[PDB]
Ligand binder design. Structure first.
Ligand SMILES: [Mg+2]
Ligand SMILES: [Zn+2]
Ligand SMILES: [Zn+2]
Lengths: 149, 76, 99, 1331, 246
DNA sequence: GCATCCGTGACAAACCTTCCAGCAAGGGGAAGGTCAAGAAATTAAT
DNA sequence: ATTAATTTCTTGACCTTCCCCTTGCTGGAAGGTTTATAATGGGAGCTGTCACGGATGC
């Protein structure tokens, strides 16, 4: 969760499009890891539809910078989600708020010259708790071209 | 001569002829089959040649007469 | 199709959108560059296109711009400034009636 | 081989080069990947595709090495023949070489005296030329149209012979003359007497004598047969995507051979003249687009709508073959990696990843695995590497020790941006860089991609270990101060170590030394701040290296003794007892390198970094909000500033001043408020209420978290703290002005959205400055590195006996730098002495190191004789005892040290960080120069001369204060009077330059007519006026015929003279001469008559020295300088000396401020026009010792004004290389008015005017060329063909036959041999002797 | 978790990261108070007063939200999400002054100075100065070390000038540019420059001989004719200019 | 002897000829690859 | 200082592919030649590239 915010975090996820956006608001009926089925209420119900807006969440696909894109579902089962809200956070969001990174204890002090010219000195818990580990999806197309031989 | 070559450059006089005769001594140490005058203590031939330079045992004319003695021994 | 595929993917305006963050996507979509045909180049520009004007208040943001050679050519759009029917940038304001 | 010889290509030479000729435009087959017979990639012409494998598959596998297969002509050899096989396209018609046609200069018209418009008329098939005619009407080189060709056909018939195009000019160049035209031009050059003709006929005759001397022919200049590039160099290779990878030069060669085949099909088919003339024109355009695509016309496009690369675009700028594939090239064993911090390492030690050292040291790994017996073969060791065996880490640790490696930042800023390192093996995937040398890199840890280069052989390994290791150089090549000084974090830890308190909870305990100091700091019972007495053992080598032992009690702190534990024996405690700022630690490292030498200094720097890291870990230096305190009287300063700008607005509304004076007043009061709030935050920051040992209240140096970064200068000057805690001073408007409303609030209070916009205006302006002008400084480094590409120390000392008189700058204000750091490392020329004429203590040739700079600092020295490189007599470099000291070593400079690229990296170092009431400030005696002074009737001394420079010399005997005084001043003190500081001693109105007369007599208005020359206008200000004159633009031709002049003589009709000279007392009357005195009054000597009124692009313009925006001309010969023709705006200027060049004239464009009048006495080399001076006339009149002194006093002060000190020798040897080509004045040795190099001029003096006979003519005149000009005037051509205009200088090298001896240092970089510099200088000593 | 450099603050004038660090320490103190009152499971109604007290400390907060209109389960989930720090917004130019950040530190059981007297890990002794410690919310970049570490040793050369390539996906080493050549020549290093431009990258018959010499242990400099200087030679010979060696 | 115009630096569609590889359904010549005979070179009786 | 049973050497005597070729087409690839109403001044940047010298025209 982004601790220090700006107020813009509540709209950048909904306006980016990579998250599950609420086109029609209602009550959560069934949430899977790869899809979210929200039951549309009667006020936002159309007679030409089925009253069910299933959001096919995009799984681990490749971006243009060799990193992961995963629309993780963040809402719980059995809770109302109104119009224009979040259902599944994207690759760098958390509950409709922009989760760019992680928050942890930082100390502005020198320690054995390791932070010499604005460098980072990390603890073990950034990888012991797997806080700063990152999925990176690359592409390697083994191409079988046809030569003369 | 691992951390300081200033004693070598003050006993020789300059940098370029020093490193040229040191590289000549190391080339005679690598494939020439010569024995080092400095103990190794798990070191490569370059710092051994530099330690032979800073001990006053290897110079320009000293390496000249050293290769001349080997040439006179081989051509005999 | 050759023209609309040479512009989409091979022009200086078309580039790889970094999809690592939603912030990167919405700052690359709201990115006002000045390269390609019609605009300037990174090597043939001066200090006039890079240094901002007092008319950049709210329309073209002076912050989000790369630190490379074209430091002022690739500008960006602010949050409240939209496009016009003509195409210029407009800033929304609240009207004051004598205080 | 030892030399590179260039000439023009003969068709027989191409026929010998060919070994196969191409006649068909086929490149390869489209189904099979085999070229067929007689093509652009063919096997008969160039060679086979694979190593020992023929075309059809009949002869292969080393069985047929030199036989030729009769089926397709293939010679079965290696692939190496595909990079050396030539062309010989059988051209049906001769064509124009566009390199010798459309260049600047074209070099085909200057051989013929034909303009380029007529060359375009004849080569493009539009106009005819006749080679010879029976009558004098159709002479040689006549330009005839087609109607004139028809008229000559019906008029002459078979008498004339006039073709069109490249064949006509080819026969004209072939059958003009060989040496008779050269002899006729040589006699007609000096037969005629002119200047506009003798600036191009001498270049024509030099071109022709180069043609006759180099054995070249003008037939070989034009192109009759075109050879193609080798096909491996233009490889049509199948890429791994399905399509092919071709070159655009293959497409241009296919188009050229297609137009050649169309011409060959047009010759036998009996074509009409229009189509064959268009075919030859199109072949000319095709070979023009192949050679240089951007000269003859529009750049030829391809399939992707792009200008295709020609043979000139392959060598042009950074994208050419030189700066991308020849000079700056990719290299193996180079690992791109980021920088990390290794603080547990020595100064010569860096980190290395085990994966990157595993893949990077693969031949060393395989050799050490085969020599130890742990691996059988190479691929078994490779499988041991690919599977990551346990023993390969141990063998990598064995091979990585005693094996230095080169760390390299890309791009480097100076010479210390790349140096060697002895790596250790750690985990991770990055390089742990030692923190002390990151300032020498100027590479902060921002993820900088550092390349790591492996020296392979033992020559390069010992060159890495003994010469370019970080333990070999503790100083910078730019200045004597160490740039490998303790940087920001460790200097903050050391400043926290050396700080003192008043409370000081370890009070009263007397410490036994450094041991007890570190003991009671580490035990926690005593703090790091305790003003106690410590018995410290100190040593000083007062004798010849003999240290003496002494121990006493000093008033110090505990942390200074803990630093003294890391300080070695040879340092004194006078450098350890102060506050120890960054400059103080620089002085400490400098004194350590001067006293102890390099042997304890590296270990001292490593221990200092270790102690600074260990006591910055325990420091807790943490910036906060309450640490960055707001001054208590901050809101009242902003309130008083608001009241002041309200008063300024009310004074602007109620009309008293204008808007410009309002802006100046609001800028002045905002600067005053900024200074007030800066002193307020400084008083609130530097003072802190702390308790004493008893109950007291005493202030001291504060323990604030930002005053440690402010006072010590760790990271950030005083302006950053004054803008952080206090308000912002001034910003930058994009038009160049300052915003009239500065930022009232500070950073801790917050900046408004308007105020952040006014801040980001100047911030984005400075960031655009850093984006553009630092790249401009990089190209300036590219410029300056290619004019000093031959300066190697060849000899030790030459007998020149001449140097420079060095003096510091006191220009305008007080002194800026002393003489000790100015002549630091320099070598004296003569036996300099004390200011008194006795006790000569300095020898002839000695350096200025310890026991020499302080020995002059204890004396009152002000100017010494220093030996330079501008007076060194030897060629192709300078001597060791003429330059001085190598700045990064600290001793006598070795033979081989290339000074010019040192100077280029030194001037390129601060390129990333550049972006009247004369009141004396000291006490001394008044001294002048070129004295013309007299006492008037008021008790003062006026000045009636122009070149008076007021200087102040105290009782000691040094020039502490100096000024530059113009003409028409009044001195309040006399010559030789002891004055005090603060008072004004020179009184003159700065808005006007008066016409003060030294003739004490009557006043007589003579040689003036009221109405024609002068007018009658009384001044309505004071009522004191006379017959005055207006400006010269309003007067009629009466002043143009009779010269107006004020002959101040006696009123009884007789004439008087000047006291001292024999000239009659007649002052001249220029414009704006409104006199304020009547006739008949007895004026005294010194009375006033009238009132006459008055940076990195600048660094690049001063280095180029081409011309400023306003050229300041100087007087040539000392004498009477008058006017020639009268002022038609910009008319003339004449100089009439008494024993000099009498009829020589000059030219004045702007008549704004004339220093000397038209008819007064001047000195040779005296200033005439005011403003920026053009150094061409300064070199033309003054010597090199004055121009070099002016440059090292101007551009070094410009670099010092930014806040960085550079040694003056680096801005001296570049200036020495800026006058490398000189202009000879008399014939007899080389030429009459050629531009010849100083080496070719020195080899002519030592051959004729030394031992052979007398003076055959060897005098010359030096010329400061531009940096773009001196790089095209080098005697070597292959280094000149890499900087810029490779087409132009390569054509100048081809038509002259410039055989390169490869004497310069880059000339062996480009050919790929050992350089004649450094360690390769001793190899070149045997190379040039055995040749 | 992170030890950051305080040296880059006064030169780069970024004092707002210190304000962000103090506000993050205050928000983390509120989060530890919520986690201490949550793991005991004492009551819920004290949290509805405490987090409401933590939501109003400025002059005028833009949202006057109340926890009295919420349910027990919603406040319990809000506190469970507030266990992992406290989400706190601050505008870019209407942000909090240091007085409200000091009030946030006072409400989270923290000193008003912002810098907490810290204890060292290596030596255990407490420093003489209090250390500014808190939350910066730093992010992982795209310039990771597995995308930055890239070396090259004799693999996949070119065909035009017989040159090593560039880029990690192309497996080519970093360019030894011309400024590095001038600096290496300013040192006077001749044998390293004769390797870096002739026998390590240029000569195809030279780098193979150098590799065979290093594999068999002979580290002797064997130079020769560069295979890209003759590229320029044949280029200007095909251009129509005669040139040869001595 | 001066103001003024270009290079050049910029971290279609049929028509007709020769030349060469494939599938019948394989045989033969040139050139290079493995099995049973007698000849060199060793040892146990004097 | 000897020679008689083993153990190699040498020599015919056989054993495979490589390549050209067998009559009879069958298809593919490379190169050159007509076709016959009327067809007659074609086409394309890109400058929003700025500041130097070197040669041209008063
Ligand atoms: Mg950087
Ligand atoms: Zn063949
Ligand atoms: Zn000399």
């Amino acid at each position: 969760k982004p601790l220090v915010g700006t107020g813009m975090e509540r709209a950048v996820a909904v306006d980016s499009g990579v998250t599950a956006v609420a086109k029609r608001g209602g009550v959560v009926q069934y949430v899977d890891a790869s899809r979210i089925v929200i039951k549309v209420n009667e006020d936002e119900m159309y007679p030409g539809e089925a009253g069910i807006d299933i959001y096919n969440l995009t799984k681990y696909t490749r971006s243009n910078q060799n990193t992961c894109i995963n629309q993780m579902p963040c809402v719980s089962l059995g809770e109302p989600v109104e119009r224009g809200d979040v259902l599944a956070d994207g690759p760098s969001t958390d509950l409709g708020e922009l989760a760019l990174g992680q928050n942890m204890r930082v100390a502005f002090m020198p320690w054995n010259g390791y932070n010499f010219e604005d460098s980072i000195l990390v603890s073990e818990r950034v990888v012991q708790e797997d806080r700063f580990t990152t999925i990176h999806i690359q592409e390697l197309a083994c191409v079988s071209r046809d030569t003369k031989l | 001569a691992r951390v300081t070559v200033q004693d070598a450059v003050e006993k020789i006089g300059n940098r370029f002829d020093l490193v040229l005769v040191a590289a000549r001594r190391a080339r005679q140490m690598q494939v020439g089959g010569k024995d080092p005058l400095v103990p190794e203590e798990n070191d490569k031939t370059t710092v051994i040649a530099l330690r032979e330079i800073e001990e006053g045992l290897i110079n320009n004319q000293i390496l000249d007469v050293r290769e001349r003695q080997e040439q006179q021994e081989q051509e005999a | 199709s050759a023209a609309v595929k040479e512009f989409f993917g091979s022009s200086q305006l078309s580039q790889f959108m970094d999809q690592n963050n939603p912030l990167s996507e919405i700052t690359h979509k709201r990115r006002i560059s000045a390269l390609g045909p019609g605009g300037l180049t990174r090597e043939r520009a001066g200090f006039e296109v890079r240094d901002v004007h007092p008319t950049h208040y709210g329309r073209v943001c002076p912050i989000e711009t790369p630190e490379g050679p074209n430091i002022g050519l690739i500008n960006s759009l602010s949050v409240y400034a939209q496009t016009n029917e003509y195409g210029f940038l407009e800033t929304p304001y609240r009207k004051v009636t004598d205080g | 081989f030892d030399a590179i010889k260039i000439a023009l290509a003969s068709p027989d030479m191409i026929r010998s080069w060919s070994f196969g000729e191409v006649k068909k435009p086929e490149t390869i087959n489209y189904r099979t990947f085999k070229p067929e017979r007689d093509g652009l990639f063919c096997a008969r012409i160039f060679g086979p595709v694979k190593d020992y494998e023929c075309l059809c598959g009949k002869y292969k596998r080393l069985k047929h090495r030199g036989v030729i297969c009769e089926k397709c002509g293939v010679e079965v050899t290696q692939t190496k023949v595909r990079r050396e096989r030539m062309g010989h396209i059988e051209l049906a018609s001769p064509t124009a070489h566009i390199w010798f046609l459309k260049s600047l200069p074209s070099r085909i018209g200057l051989l013929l005296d034909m303009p380029l418009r007529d060359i375009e008329r004849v080569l493009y098939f539009e106009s005819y030329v006749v080679i010879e005619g029976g009558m004098t009407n159709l002479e040689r080189q006549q330009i005839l149209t087609e109607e004139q060709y028809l008229d000559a056909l019906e008029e002459f018939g078979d008498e004339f012979d006039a073709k069109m195009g490249a064949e006509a000019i080819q026969a004209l160049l072939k059958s003009m003359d060989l040496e008779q035209e050269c002899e006729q031009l040589r006699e007609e050059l000096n037969e005629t007497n002119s200047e506009t003709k003798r600036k191009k006929l001498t270049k024509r005759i030099k071109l022709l004598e180069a043609f006759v001397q180099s054995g070249n022919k003008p037939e070989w200049m034009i192109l009759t047969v075109l050879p193609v590039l080798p096909p491996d160099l233009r490889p049509l290779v199948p890429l791994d995507g399905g399509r092919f990878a071709t070159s655009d030069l293959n497409d241009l060669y296919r188009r050229v051979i297609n137009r050649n085949n169309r011409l060959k099909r047009l010759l036998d088919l009996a074509a009409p003249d229009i189509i064959v003339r268009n075919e030859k024109r199109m072949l000319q355009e095709a070979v023009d687009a192949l050679l240089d695509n951007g000269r003859r016309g529009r750049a030829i496009t391809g399939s992707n709508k792009r200008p295709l690369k020609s043979l000139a675009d392959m060598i042009k700028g950074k994208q050419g073959r030189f700066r991308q594939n020849l000079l700056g090239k990719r290299v193996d064993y180079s690992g791109r990696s980021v920088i990390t911090v290794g603080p547990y390492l020595r100064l010569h030690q860096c980190g290395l990843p085990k994966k990157m050292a595993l893949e990077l040291f693969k031949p060393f790994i395989y050799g050490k695995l085969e020599l130890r017996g742990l691996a059988t073969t190479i691929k078994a060791a490779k499988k041991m590497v690919e599977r990551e065996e346990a023993v390969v880490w141990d063998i990598l640790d064995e091979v990585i020790r005693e094996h230095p490696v080169l760390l390299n930042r890309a791009p480097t800023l100076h010479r210390l941006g790349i140096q060697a390192f002895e790596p250790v093996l750690i985990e991770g995937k990055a390089i742990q860089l030692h923190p002390l040398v990151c300032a020498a890199y100027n590479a902060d840890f921002d993820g900088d991609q550092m390349a790591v280069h492996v020296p392979l052989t033992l020559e390069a390994q010992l060159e890495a270990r003994a010469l370019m290791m970080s333990t070999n150089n503790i100083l910078s090549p730019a200045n004597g101060e160490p740039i490998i000084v303790p940087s920001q974090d460790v200097v903050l830890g050391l400043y926290y170590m050396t700080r003192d308190c008043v409370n000081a909870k370890g009070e009263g305990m007397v410490l036994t030394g450094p041991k007890e100091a570190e003991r009671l700091y580490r035990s926690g019972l005593a703090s790091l701040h305790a003003r106690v007495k410590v018995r410290i053992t100190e040593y000083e080598k007062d004798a010849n290296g003999e240290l003496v032992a002494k121990t006493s009690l000093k008033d110090t702190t505990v942390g200074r003794a803990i630093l003294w534990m890391i300080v070695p024996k040879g340092l004194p405690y006078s450098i350890v007892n102060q506050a120890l700022g960054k400059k103080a630690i620089s002085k400490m490292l400098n004194t350590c390198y001067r006293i102890l030498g390099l042997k304890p200094t590296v270990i001292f720097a490593d221990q200092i970094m270790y102690t600074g890291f260990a006591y910055a870990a325990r420091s807790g230096a943490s910036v906060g909000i309450d640490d960055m305190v707001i001054p208590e009287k901050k809101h009242e300063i902003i309130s008083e500033a608001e009241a002041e700008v309200a008063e300024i607005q009310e004074q602007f509304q109620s009309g008293l001043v204008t808007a410009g004076e309002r802006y100046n007043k609001v800028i002045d009061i905002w600067a005053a408020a900024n200074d007030r709030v800066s002193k307020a935050m400084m008083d609130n920051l530097q003072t802190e209420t702390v308790i004493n040992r008893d109950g007291q209240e005493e202030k001291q140096v504060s323990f604030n978290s930002i005053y440690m970064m402010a006072d010590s200068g760790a990271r950030g000057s005083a302006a950053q703290i004054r803008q952080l805690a206090g308000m912002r001073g001034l910003m930058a408007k994009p038009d160049g002005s300052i915003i009239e409303t500065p930022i009232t609030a500070n950073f801790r209070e917050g900046l408004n959205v308007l105020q952040y916009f006014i801040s980001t205006h100047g911030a984005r302006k400075g960031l655009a400055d850093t984006a553009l002008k630092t790249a401009n400084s990089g190209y300036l480094t590219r410029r300056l590195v290619d004019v000093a590409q031959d300066l190697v120390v060849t000899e030790d000392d030459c007998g020149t006996h001449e140097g420079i008189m060095m003096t510091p700058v006191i220009e305008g204000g007080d002194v800026k730098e002393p003489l000790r750091d100015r002549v630091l490392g320099r070598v004296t020329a003569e036996d300099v002495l004390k200011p008194g004429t006795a006790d000569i203590l300095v020898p002839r040739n000695t350096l200025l190191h310890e026991q020499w700079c302080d020995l002059l600092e204890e004396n009152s020295v002000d100017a010494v004789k220093v030996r330079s490189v501008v007076s060194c007599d030897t060629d192709f470099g300078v001597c060791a005892h003429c330059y001085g000291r190598d700045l990064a070593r600290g001793h006598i400079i070795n033979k081989g040290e290339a000074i010019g690229v040192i100077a280029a990296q030194s001037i390129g170092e601060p390129g990333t960080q550049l972006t009247s009431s004369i009141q004396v400030k000291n006490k001394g005696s008044i001294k002048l120069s070129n004295v013309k002074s007299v006492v008037n009737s008021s008790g003062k001394l006026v000045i009636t001369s122009r070149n008076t420079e007021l200087k102040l010399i105290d009782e000691f005997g040094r020039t502490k204060e100096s000024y530059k005084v113009p003409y028409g001043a009044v001195l309040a003190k006399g010559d030789g009077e002891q004055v005090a500081g603060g008072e004004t001693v020179a009184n003159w109105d700065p808005h006007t330059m008066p016409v003060i007369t030294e003739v004490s007599g009557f006043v007589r208005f003579t040689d003036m007519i009221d109405g024609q020359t002068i007018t009658r206008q009384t001044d309505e200000l004071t009522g004191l006026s006379s017959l005055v004159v207006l400006d010269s633009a309003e007067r009629t031709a009466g002043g143009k015929d009779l010269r107006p002049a004020l002959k101040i003589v006696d009123a009884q009709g007789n004439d008087v003279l000047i006291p001292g000279t024999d000239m009659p007392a007649q002052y001249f009357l220029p414009g704006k001469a409104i006199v304020q005195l009547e006739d008949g009054v007895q004026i005294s000597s010194g009375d006033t008559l009238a009132r006459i009124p008055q940076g990195l692009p600048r660094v690049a313009d001063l280095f180029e020295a081409r011309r400023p925006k306003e050229p300041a001309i100087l007087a040539e010969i000392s004498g009477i300088v008058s006017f020639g023709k009268e002022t038609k705006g910009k008319r003339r200027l004449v100089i009439t000396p008494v024993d000099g060049s009498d009829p020589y004239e000059e030219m004045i464009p702007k008549w704004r401020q004339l220093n000397v009048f038209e008819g007064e006495r001047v000195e040779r080399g005296d200033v005439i026009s005011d403003g920026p001076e053009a150094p061409h006339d300064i070199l033309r009149l003054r010597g090199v010792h004055a121009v070099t002194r002016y440059i090292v006093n101007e551009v070094q002060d410009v670099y010092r004004l930014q806040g960085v000190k550079i040694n003056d020798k680096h801005i001296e040897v570049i200036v020495r290389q800026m006058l490398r080509k000189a202009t000879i004045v008399n014939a007899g040795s080389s030429d009459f008015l050629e531009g010849e190099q100083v080496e070719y001029s020195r080899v002519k003096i030592a051959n004729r005017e030394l031992e052979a006979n007398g003076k055959v003519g060897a005098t010359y005149s030096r010329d400061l060329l531009g940096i773009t000009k001196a790089s095209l005037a080098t005697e070597s051509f292959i280094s000149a063909a890499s900087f810029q205009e490779t087409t132009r200088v390569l054509t100048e090298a081809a038509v002259a036959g410039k055989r390169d001896e490869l004497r310069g240092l880059k000339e062996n970089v480009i050919v790929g041999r050992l350089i004649p510099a450094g360690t390769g200088y001793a190899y070149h000593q045997d190379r040039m002797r055995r040749r | 978790d992170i030890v950051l450099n305080p040296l880059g603050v006064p030169s780069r004038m970024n004092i707002g990261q210190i304000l962000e660090t103090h506000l993050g320490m205050a928000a983390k103190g509120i989060g530890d108070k919520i986690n201490a009152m949550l793991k005991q499971q004492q009551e819920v109604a004290k949290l509805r007063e405490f987090i409401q007290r933590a939501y109003d400390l400025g002059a005028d907060v833009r949202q006057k939200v109340d926890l009295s209109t919420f349910s027990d389960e919603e406040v319990m989930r809000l506190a469970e999400n507030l266990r992992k720090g406290m989400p706190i917004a601050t505008p870019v130019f209407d942000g909090a002054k240091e007085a409200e950040i000091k009030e946030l530190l006072k409400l989270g059981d923290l000193p008003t100075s912002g810098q907490i007297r810290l204890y060292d890990g290596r030596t255990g002794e407490q420093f003489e100065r209090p250390v500014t410690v808190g939350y910066m919310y730093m992010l992982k970049l795209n310039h990771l070390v597995d995308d930055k570490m890239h070396a090259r040793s004799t693999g996949s050369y070119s065909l035009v000038t017989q040159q090593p390539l560039g880029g990690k996906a192309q497996f080519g080493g970093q360019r030894f540019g011309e400024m590095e050549v001038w600096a290496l020549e300013a040192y006077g290093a001749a044998y390293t420059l004769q390797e870096m431009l002739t026998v390590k990258s240029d000569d195809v018959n030279g780098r193979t001989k150098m590799y065979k010499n290093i594999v068999d242990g002979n580290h002797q400099m064997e130079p020769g004719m560069p295979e890209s200087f003759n590229v320029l030679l044949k280029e200007i010979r095909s251009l129509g200019i005669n040139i040869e060696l001595e």
